[PDB]
Symmetry: C3
Subunit: 146 residues, 3 copies
Amino acid sequence: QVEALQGQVQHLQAAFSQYKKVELFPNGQSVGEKIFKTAGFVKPFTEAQLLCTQAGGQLASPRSAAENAALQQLVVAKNEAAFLSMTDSKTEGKFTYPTGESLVYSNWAPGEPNDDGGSEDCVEIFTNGKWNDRACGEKRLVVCEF
Amino acid sequence: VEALQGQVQHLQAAFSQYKKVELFPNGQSVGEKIFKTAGFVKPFTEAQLLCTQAGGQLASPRSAAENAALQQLVVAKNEAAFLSMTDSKTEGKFTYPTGESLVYSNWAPGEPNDDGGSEDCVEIFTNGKWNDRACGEKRLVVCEF
Amino acid sequence: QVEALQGQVQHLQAAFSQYKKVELFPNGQSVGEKIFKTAGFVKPFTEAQLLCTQAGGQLASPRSAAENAALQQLVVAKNEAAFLSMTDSKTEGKFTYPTGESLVYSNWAPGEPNDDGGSEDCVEIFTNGKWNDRACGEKRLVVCEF
Ligand SMILES: OC[C@H]1O[C@H](O)[C@@H](O)[C@@H](O)[C@@H]1O
Ligand SMILES: OC[C@H]1O[C@H](O)[C@@H](O)[C@@H](O)[C@@H]1O
Ligand SMILES: OC[C@H]1O[C@H](O)[C@@H](O)[C@@H](O)[C@@H]1O
Ligand SMILES: [Ca+2]
Ligand SMILES: [Ca+2]
Ligand SMILES: [Ca+2]
Ligand SMILES: [Ca+2]
Ligand SMILES: [Ca+2]
Ligand SMILES: [Ca+2]
Ligand SMILES: [Ca+2]
Ligand SMILES: [Ca+2]
Ligand SMILES: [Ca+2]
Ligand SMILES: [Ca+2]
């Protein structure tokens, strides 16, 4: 019986693995156990953030060079800089994930973050993978992670 | 017979993650039903063909809960969508594709009104309310699975 | 534990069967054990090929009338001719799959392939389903198989 129930499960694993690859083409990227997926359009930080959380995930939060490179592929493909989840709204100069935890990785472009105009508390990632603090009111590519 | 339970556990976790990814950003889950928009507009007939060939049917909200779920997609695309119901067989009596009569409705004030004497299809607005409309018009294609 | 486990697998099978239909709508077509999926946009051959391979698949390669007809439904729906994976770049006049093996099926339009202008080594499929050898530098609908 187990011999049969397992043949059912392994058949399922096979079909599921194929559908996973199909799902990620062409708006997603898998890295480790995390999955980045772009919505394809642009929006202000607040709305971008609400879209991701309501979908059961959150805004892209690269925690390593590999994750950042994975996210960059999506930005490059859509040719639109994207918003990350991190902000320094609570304490100027100190960026944190939505959980309040401090960054464990960063890829700031030379000269950033600079809080230009005295009001750049959000983060965007360029097609070259570098980060820049930007005003939360600007519209950027929406990319969520799951 | 335990390493098999380990596989099922891994599958449940992975499949659960994949479901969320799939629904973003064009689908809405509610109960055992799934609404998904194609992202473009089409006349009723073509819109209906697209859903049936895909193994489903045009959105058919049967409760305040399903309508709210469907409303989220319409609002997201800012484009009214077609429902599956029509009164083309018997004017004034809207039915599902199967044939049964509506078990739920959310008509806007004064609707349905067969305006111009030619509105046998139904569209749902960004506000969730329904309006009977000419089937030849082009509206957001949303199917249910 | 079996009865409780048989219930889980049954639930998984039911949920998966539903999600396969959801996934294929509206850019995919399933035929046999193969799945065709269009990215929705056009690109030259080299760019198209890279996109599919990096996603873990390859450009559409219909190996039968059934597969070709399924691929045709996508091209018709997007109203855009697509690139297939085969080319005769190595040996002029001899089309092969990415693996180098010879074609086991073809659906050439009358008179094709004609290596027009002596520079057509790629293949495109029209909305009517026929094939035509074309210059790889042209932009065509991107469709991958998994
Ligand atoms: O528009 C804001 C933007 O302007 C320039 O590009 C730079 O000073 C950036 O650091 C800054 O974020
Ligand atoms: O244009 C048709 C449309 O006009 C108005 O919006 C209303 O009378 C609707 O009931 C009707 O369907
Ligand atoms: O030149 C592009 C195209 O022109 C005509 O349609 C035919 O000769 C085709 O074989 C050729 O590929
Ligand atoms: Ca999908
Ligand atoms: Ca500040
Ligand atoms: Ca700041
Ligand atoms: Ca800056
Ligand atoms: Ca009528
Ligand atoms: Ca009517
Ligand atoms: Ca009306
Ligand atoms: Ca040649
Ligand atoms: Ca040639
Ligand atoms: Ca030719």
